[model samples]
Target: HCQDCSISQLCIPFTLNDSELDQLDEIIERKKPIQKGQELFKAGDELKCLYAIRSGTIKSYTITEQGDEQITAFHLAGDLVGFDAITEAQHPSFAQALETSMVCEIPYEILDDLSGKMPKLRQQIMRLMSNEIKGDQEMILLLSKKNAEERLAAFLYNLSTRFHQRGFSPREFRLTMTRGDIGNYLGLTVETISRLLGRFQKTEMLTVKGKYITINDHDALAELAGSAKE
Candidate 1:
């Protein structure tokens, strides 16, 4: 079935042959669709599975000492969730559906057992872990050094690239998270986010309508994002 999965190329199944994928698929559990605002897991929940998004968006956030939600990541289809819990065996943040979503649950213990016998799968797992570390490092850089406009630009560019990887149009997509959530994640105020979007729209760089966005000038946006190297 993994072979028929549309986004399989972007996930763990990409690393395995048909028979090997069947082995991996046997351990995966697909459940009911997650509705918007429903939590898949909460902070301190024992990590039972690593989820692969079948469709839709999920946001993971942690509660700060001030009782504020500090969003860590916005995961889309084909992305893996719960790698952060691998070390502690518990989720450090809450993962919730941003919209009606589907996911495949891979029990880590069974995955671990299978990976031990499959060299390619083992390597792929390590690669994914390394990518998680790299993404955290990038987020740190974005928050600490970039200005408001740059942060927003970088965020858009990153999302565009990810969408492109998943066979979606890089220049346009719907925003599942709200402006408030984007502000929280980027360390900007909601007003600032609105102002920046207005400015970009005026400059013919982007067109925003409610939750929908279109990148009118990809090169200009990339330049603003300072993602030349990327």
Candidate 2:
């Protein structure tokens, strides 16, 4: 439970005192496993709890008018999900497991009550909300202003930074999401995604072997991402 949760350091429950942790430990439903392709929550589902991913990956997406799945974000291990529904009675997007994943479900009533008593807990939630806002702004910039190459560069740099934050390699990591998922998230077609990846690999700026990627020129990628202004 809370005593040894693997992601406790990065989770909202981090820095909680014994009394606060006791309340959280009681409310948290742990080890809720979701297999690959299985949904954790659907759009319009009840917002009873927020999810803290313990392991593996989850993709947050929504269905479009054309019945296509549009990926919104990738939730890695130690990341929290369901923040979008905090103010709403129902979720607006679907969350599905990219691989077999484990999550801790934090009941809303308990967390809300405890947050009022725990300034650190409340601030953690606020920080999470702030991060969500920042991510949305970045997505708008990537989609609206950045060209194809710049978009890819920004995407890679973003992924690299996120991985590093989770104690993973900054220059190399496996892409758990498929090309189609990446394509959808980045607002590009699969063919274009493939073409751009090929271009990135061909230039020796990065190397990709199937789902794995290794950035050979991280600074160049950052420069490209930083230069995208319109």
Candidate 3:
């Protein structure tokens, strides 16, 4: 059950009652772990199910006509993936595991049917879809307007907030995505990411030990992110 899941509060199980949760759980399939670098779903694949991540990280990206891979999203545990495929019943991006991960597969047709009968579940689904749109808008703002430093700061701050929501330490966590992936997602060069991280460390804003990060000064970092007020 979702009630006993560690990240339940941050997932679809958040406001569901026991019987309703059980109904939702009945349609979910807990599949075997996905190995690192494994593709969960590829672009052009038929849309079948949405995945609720149980552990580890997944990155969704698309290849351009020039054959360049552009990452669209990094989905962490407790988040859902495959929403982008809802429109035309085909995936537009490839979703790959960044680490060994587990996900609960929820078939879209059954979920749609169940949601129609359960008003709360329907509301939750709509809310999640809206959140996805809001996240895309935020990414657009980050890529189009923010400078290099602000972009990195905003990214870290956003990750920190997400970690906190998932019941993890906001001030410290490991980045499952590599620096190269981060650069690709943030539209920065790997060198720029490294230099900015080094500068942030020198300024006592945060400490980076390989993939591990510890935010030493949350307020300063959030202020730099320009998200402190919000």
| TM-score of every prediction relative to native | 0.96, 0.93, 0.96
C-alpha RMSD in Å of predicted model 2 compared with the true structure: 1.7
Model 1 — TM-score against the truth? Answer: 0.96
Q: List the residue pairs that clash in candidate 2.
A: none
Candidate topping lDDT: 3
Prediction 1 global C-alpha lDDT: 0.89
Following a full C-alpha superposition, what root-mean-square deviation does model 3 have from the true structure?
2.1
Model 1: lowest-lDDT 10 consecutive positions: 221-230
Candidate 3, residues 37-123, lDDT tens digits: the string is 999898999999999999999999999999999999999998999998999999988999999999899899998898888888889
- How many angstroms is residue 76 displaced in model 3 relative to the true structure, after the best TM-score fit? 0.8
Candidate 1 Cα outliers beyond 4 Å, as residue runs: 227-230
Off by over 4 Å in 3: 227-230
Per-residue lDDT of candidate 1, residues 108-201 (tens digit): 8889888899998899888888888899999998877789989999999999999999998998998889999999999999999999999999
Worst 10 residues of 3 by lDDT: 221-230
lDDT for 42 in candidate 2 is: 92
Q: Write the per-residue lDDT of candidate 2 for residues 98-147, one digit (tens) a residue.
A: 98998888888778897898898998889888988998898988898998
**All candidates in order of lDDT, best leading:** 3, 1, 2
